Amino acid sequence: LKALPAIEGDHNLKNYEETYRHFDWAEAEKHFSWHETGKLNAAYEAIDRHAESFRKNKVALYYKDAKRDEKYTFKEMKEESNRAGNVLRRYGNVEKGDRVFIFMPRSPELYFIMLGAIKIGAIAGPLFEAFMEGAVKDRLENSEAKVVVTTPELLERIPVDKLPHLQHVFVVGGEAESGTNIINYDEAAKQESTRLDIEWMDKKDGFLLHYTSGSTGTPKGVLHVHEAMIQQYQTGKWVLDLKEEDIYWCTADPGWVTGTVYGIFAPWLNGATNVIVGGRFSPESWYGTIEQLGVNVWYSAPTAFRMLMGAGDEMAAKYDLTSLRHVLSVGEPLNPEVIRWGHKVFNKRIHDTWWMTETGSQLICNYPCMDIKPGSMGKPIPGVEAAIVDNQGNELPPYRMGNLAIKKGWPSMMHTIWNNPEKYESYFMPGGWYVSGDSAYMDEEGYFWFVGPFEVESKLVEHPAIAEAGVIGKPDPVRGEIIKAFIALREGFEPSDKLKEEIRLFVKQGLAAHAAPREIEFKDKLPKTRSGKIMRRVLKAWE
Template structure:
């Protein structure tokens, strides 16, 4: 195991990256890096497991051929460098083919989470200007409600194929498996992501090709992915952690990845860990807490299988760390990142450094992470402030701003994360909380503005405010405060109607699990919503309830 101090002070990463990518950074193609370079090895690239127990495996060579066919289809449609191709697909081989084939022709892949409703999909497609959206029969009907929807390609049986749609299998069968990859510069985008905000809808940001270097560093140093490991990242590739580190990261290292196309459960998790001899596991604290809730059933099912476990998406509870050590004899480490940055603060499995309960860890090599006060001055240990990236001394920091071109996150040489942290004496950093209103629930980031907008679309609602309410299982749950129209009476039935309305329009993880009807919302004199007042009221209620229960 390498010493962290040595690894973290080596800032010649661009030269190292050029060597790792088998060339210089002026001519890159993500399909080459994540597929073509590894064909000669004969290794498996994807292990796929269906919800019904069916399974398949695909080599890098097989994926290369299918990606080339998909790439030729795109070229026939006039889609090439810089164009956007969206994927609304579950975790299947077709998803991976669409991603790799998009990259092959120099186009940009845009993920759409399959739990998104029409409103969330329409916002992302209209902002991206996507030329094509690839979906399957289970998600196809959502696109009927999307205004201005681009051309559609559907993975479906012949009997389910819609008139006017391109058929995925038929179209690929007609194409040649010879498609020359398009080489681009390191700053050319290969992914288009959207990230939640507090004052507007989700914002688009482009991920440049040079980010692959940073993704590899995380897989190597933090996840400690070794050639002999069997790796499974539980995250969906519709989100950053899954797309960055269940697809791009492992494949670019020539390592296989695992897709499970089914709902999360203790039974399926244990089955897949055993069937594929998983030794290196990554996921969210919510998933781990659900597994722990199964008690010894889960522990007995996988004890002795795992070598290391990584956690990302929300702070890792100390009790989860202790449970994995005591019951499974395995180390689980906390990792921190954002869609804009990738993972930048970790307790590294592959580097030697102190690990403290409650600390998010140390800066990922290639990044300088600091804590700033309200005047954007760097703080010493022991004082809470805003986590920031020193961009001038972070050669692996690839985020250049949102597609809109404007952001308050850049102040001088710093990128401000919006998270409150504290620097510890040994150089590690502990997470304190969000400094804005973005909600973290079950590992997902939810922008309150999106939920409020969906609620206000309902004719019964005049105003709405949405907050994250502290929750021991999900970190936070989404709670809405709703002001109703003059002639509408509050009721449990109406609350359920509003919940379903949001769930159908946005996503299953975004809907408010709690709705409280109020007559007015707290605002500033200028009319700006003060969500923090509502959040503080909820925390005070929870504390009062806990005190009452303790004295009873």
Template sequence: MGACHAFPSIEGAIMSSASPRNMTDYEAVYRSFRWERPEHFNFATDVIDVQASGRPEALALLWSDEGGQARRFTFAELRRHSLQAARFLTDLGLRRGDRVFVLMPRIPEWWFIVLGCMRAGIVFMPGTPMLTAKDIRYRLAAAEARAVITEASCLERFEGLVGTGQVKHWIALGEVPSPWIRYAPEEGTATDGVSFEPTRADEPMLLYFTSGTTGMPKMVLHTHASYGLGHTVTGRYWLDLTPEDRHLTLSDTGWAKCAWGKLFGPWSQGACNVVYDYRGRFDAPRILKMLETQRVTTFCAPPTAWRALVLQDLSKYDLSAIRHAVSAGEPLNPEVIDSWKAATGLHIREGYGQTETVVVVGMFPALEPRVGSMGKPSPGFTVSVIDEQGQEVGPGQEGDIAVRVAPERPVGLFQGYLQDDAANEACRRGDWYVTGDRAVKDADGYFYFVGRADDVIKTSGYRVGPFEVESALIEHAAVAESAVIGVPDERIGQRIKAYVVLAPGYTGSPALATELQEHVKRTTAAYKYPREIEFVTELPKTVSGKIRRAELRGSAR
């Protein structure tokens, strides 16, 4: 039970109809877990094709959009479509190792194309449709992309870019003008006899660009093993998936979270991947109705979505099919967790990881939840809190979250930052990979997030994590969302400033600001109260939905 296996052993794991609880004894699983390190591994052939062979009619992808359209695909159909995609791309002349920038909304073709890239050994680079032409230009140049694949509705994002740089193929779905090539693999594209040379597990598979919360995005290189095989831990132990599940993760296709919960995680366990394609602003009632009608059994959402969902009257929706709920991206306020549990009986279990990793810390189903904690280390990972010298600190002491990479590097960790020796050196401290996040670990091994190392506020001799203050603020009924930063102050080093988005029905005023300050003093240590409060209509965020505190600090100077 404790081992995470590569193909062919993975076949037994994903084909079985095991208990809905893949982990009933955390310590036993953690102790017995061993990574298998195959010489060859390809998620498309070693997972999707195994499913297509053993369960050809099992539902793999259940897609719908806000207009009421719906499409369903079995594993056999997924195999066929992805083979057609691979054939289409290679017929154009794309070869193993070529980098392809894929910017598409949540449509089934995105999954066909990225699986097709995997089959052919083409390195895909996901991007969100929210990127600007400037963002895209940077990515295409930095990665030396050989092709672009998008949808007709996104062509304006590439204005002024077509024909520039090293991009040779400009491909798009739908009716597109020259020099764009129409993506139409199903028009006579045969798959019989289509095969590709075996893929080494350590070959490059995809490039992600970091969120860029503190600087220009870095290129994160993953191999077929690090994400394709590594996310078995995410799907089996944290998402707790089985072949009987219908799983929904709320994520854009451009985010690493999509790989976690809309690609490798669910399909590594043979679960059905539920996709809801919405193009406008987040609509909490619509999402809740979709959870009800699609009978979603396991659900993952980012904190921004969870905060909006619990503001609804949850009693109006039949959410009884949901048996497991998780959150990742940023810490989730305990108040939100309590609201969801009161309505559904389910604790939202947090998980921690990065674009660079699979889930490395999680509140796994076998763990007793602790308020404010993100859980314990994932099977296959040694995670700790270390100091500047690379030494582990004691319980209750704040330090840097780090993953041990020596003497053996975990499978589910990225290969490195591409073309960035300085970043690769900066994230290594002795035998540890340093994540850049701060935390405290208690005597029982539970982790408590403090904040990004750059976000921690030093005020009056104290160190304050912004999340502590934000969590206290959101307990107040007037607060829908908040972001906290440190502002330079000659007297106390930094003073705490809060940006507050108000809940419906509230209006910002000096009196309300004072009320919120007093509320924080009562809720947490008095020195953590925000000396300044600014009411705003929205907070600056990265394309993956994380708050850009660096931008707030820059504007506050």
């Protein structure tokens, strides 16, 4: 692994070391209007501050999909969000601290609704359409949300009669029958005015709700505070490298947390240009978007990048991708292979950023102003003390496994787990170390750190005793993952422990040291489809 050298330019974080040594949140708060005025709101500082600044006539939203190619600026986005907040207050009977839930696919109306809900102080909680009736019903039951905005294709997936606390259901587009609790958005926005009397919030009250599918089977509602906005801006200044001329495209859905803060709030707190691509995924559409829109800053996920590589680099060569300037990946530890492919195609580097729902906004990030280690997330942002702790809360020297913890006190926190202070207090550890539940470790420099089955599979067949096999990666706490293989022996060969080691050594001598299987199991036959294909998802599900 060879560290990617930085590129000289007019960055925003000129020197990371000097800032990390001499950064205070007071100067960061000085960048915000409430430091001088005292009136604070995250949505205000994400939209209205720039809609009143010189960025008023700057493209804020680049919406493209299979049908629409609409464009919105900061003034128009402010007007739309204000209209959504007005309609939510007037029709949804929503007040301070309430819960408003979002059930929409990628569209401008989604961002308008969520920004309007946050502006009036209602805690906004997004949802994903892939959820069945059970998941959405459970989420509204736990949240006791008064309002849920939906789409006609998903109106039938919400049990309005079942939920007692649910009061209003909004539908967007189409022709949905206006029931007792079913109000259509489009007209409600149509006659409603724009100007919104924004309600001003304290430092310690919530503005975002987000439900994560927990290990217990029931989701939990993370409630972030408006103070988190502070951190967002600074991250949107430093890791995201938004200059005044950058076109920023976040590919995450707004139903998730990542598409809610760094696809909505972080870019616009800096007054940048968000890009949203609706419709179905298609590499032609994505590459054409990057080409004709001239995307400079990219924020995507390793899954989408991997699908883009699966498309083929020739399709990328069919378009012009030299307009890219800055690439970032969230949602999963970036693979070095994706990094190499991105550098080869776009001639730009990708930077993995780490955070989760309980975190609020990204903490440990690869930085354009420092050498990039592709396998590392990066270093904590200045003013935030991230480290590695054991089960006792004591700090640990680098280069050793441990539980990643954050020094409690940073502006981007959950104000609560909604109606669950027990899960609150379970999240934090003695000593003021918030625990995120992830495994990570640092190195000497200060960066933080969290296999093709076929080459083993092709190696296996060379034995005269086995006809076919299947290899999966069993998770490991020391080596990350260990190689496990299920072997169906040929006729005349019987399973035993003596021949198990013979497989390991033959793979060891013929392949890499880490390519040797660590666990071997024997089967009469592997799971195979009717045609004869071998699937491994069933194998790892069984394991």
